[PDB]
Design a protein around this ligand. Sequence first.
Ligand code: SRM
Ligand code: SF4
Ligand code: NO2
Ligand code: CL
Ligand code: CL
Ligand code: K
Length: 538
Amino acid sequence: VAAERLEPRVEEKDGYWILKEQFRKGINPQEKVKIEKEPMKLFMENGIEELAKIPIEEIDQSKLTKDDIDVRLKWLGLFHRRKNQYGRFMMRLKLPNGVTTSAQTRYLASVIRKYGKEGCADITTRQNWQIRGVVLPDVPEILKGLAEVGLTSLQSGMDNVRNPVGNPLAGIDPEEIVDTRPYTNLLSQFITGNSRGNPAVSNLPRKWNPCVVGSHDLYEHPHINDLAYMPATKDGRFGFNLLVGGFFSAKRCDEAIPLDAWVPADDVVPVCRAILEAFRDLGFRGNRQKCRMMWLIDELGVEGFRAEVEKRMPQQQLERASPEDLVQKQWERRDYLGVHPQKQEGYSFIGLHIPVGRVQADDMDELARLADEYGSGEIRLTVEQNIIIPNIETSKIEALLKEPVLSTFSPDPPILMKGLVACTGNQFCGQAIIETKARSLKITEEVQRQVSLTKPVRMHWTGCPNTCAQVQVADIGFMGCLTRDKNGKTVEGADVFLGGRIGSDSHLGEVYKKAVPCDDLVPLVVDLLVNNFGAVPR
Ligand code: SRM
Ligand code: SF4
Ligand SMILES: O=N[O-]
Ligand SMILES: [Cl-]
Ligand SMILES: [Cl-]
Ligand SMILES: [K+]
């Protein structure tokens, strides 16, 4: 690698970071959008106020403003559903560690309630909230309303640092390694500039996913994050070994690799900053399929990339990885659904199944009511698109289990539902090839009617090769495709994946059988469960 390759390609100009004039050749169209107008100005210079007043039909008549609503608004967490729900915006938060309050939940419910049939909300595979139905004229008021209740939607889409994932049992599990909340909180504060915007990390070549591990279970999926903090003691000091570059895409899925770096616990933010600066400064900005950070690591080599991180650390210090980390390889991932005692004597948490992560406003209000009546007004989201209500006095559990809403959001649903994960799909997502959420529920219900089993089989449904629902981690994964029935008619189908493992002994699954019509999946899956996962026909 020539020394010229290491020249930073972006520069700070008037509070924002822009590609240098000599590093603009051959850039992709998204890079051109970012140069044409700085997306962060919509928030930081209140550009949204005037934009929101322009009728959408008028907005669509010019490239600049159409790009504002279709692309730049993703820096404010707003996602125009142009193809499948025209004129409506999905809105996505920052929610470090998946932690929400009842007041925040009620606020979000109040926003979606306004939109009637166009509104609903979803828990995401980064333990985050998305709300739906938003119209552009309401955006300024919603941004103000979010801030009022202590929420931000900043930098949650496009070429930004995505939701910092942590241990859903942080602070409450007797078996936790380290409470991840302080760290994910710090990361989110750093990323968003304390909810004011942080332009230093908002012009990346591509999206970038961070997580902080605090569980032996590895609930945080460190193997598939761009930066994963693995708790590790080194030379008598608590800190983190760092894994880098994990990612999924249509073209390529790769597990994170060791940076060969350990940082003291207090250096979590400094090293996040150093890694992001190196990625921002040096990353490829051509073909979008080759812009994730792993591609830079491969170009420089991991040692070459490490040197770039090291030079950007305070005092240019970056220790080598600790020989061992604190995560115990002797471990079985634990079910968190149901009632579990906390480390605080006399308290329990309850994990509740949210079918395919989908809720309506009334459901949100009810969950918020439960968290207030039974817990501490806290609702935690999980990456399987479920919830945990922590901090419940154990003597209240008997009454809680009788609450009518628990018949819908159950502490003990059938085992296949416990592990079911599904992306948005074509109800709202323009890239989706198939409908996912309704279909996956229907198929799973039919499968479980036919077989019983005791193994916690994890089934993931994703609507297109972007694999937002992570089919490569599943015991059985389903990737949307179009295929053909016996008469040659177009039908929805799935490419079926097998081989995904999570926890310490992680492994990426691969296509097992292509082009299976969705209407033919039940017998295939029933047989796979009996033959490979110990299921028994009813
Ligand atoms: C909501 C969510 C799936 C869900 O049902 O839970 C989701 C939904 C979408 N993803 Fe994703 N992704 C979601 C997690 C993921 C993950 C999983 C993860 O983070 O562990 C991945 C795979 C892992 C990874 O990225 O390394 C993922 C890979 C993508 C990709 C492919 C990235 C790539 O490098 O090629 C895109 C397309 C892109 O960014 O170019 C995409 C694009 C999109 C968009 C924003 C596309 C769009 O504008 O329509 C989807 C919005 C649909 C909608 O209305 O909801 N989404 N997306 C997840 C939101 C997470 C969050 O709260 O921030
Ligand atoms: S996997 Fe495809 S269909 Fe599903 S939410 Fe992601 S982009 Fe949309
Ligand atoms: O928002 N899915 O990258
Ligand atoms: Cl995006
Ligand atoms: Cl679209
Ligand atoms: K779920």
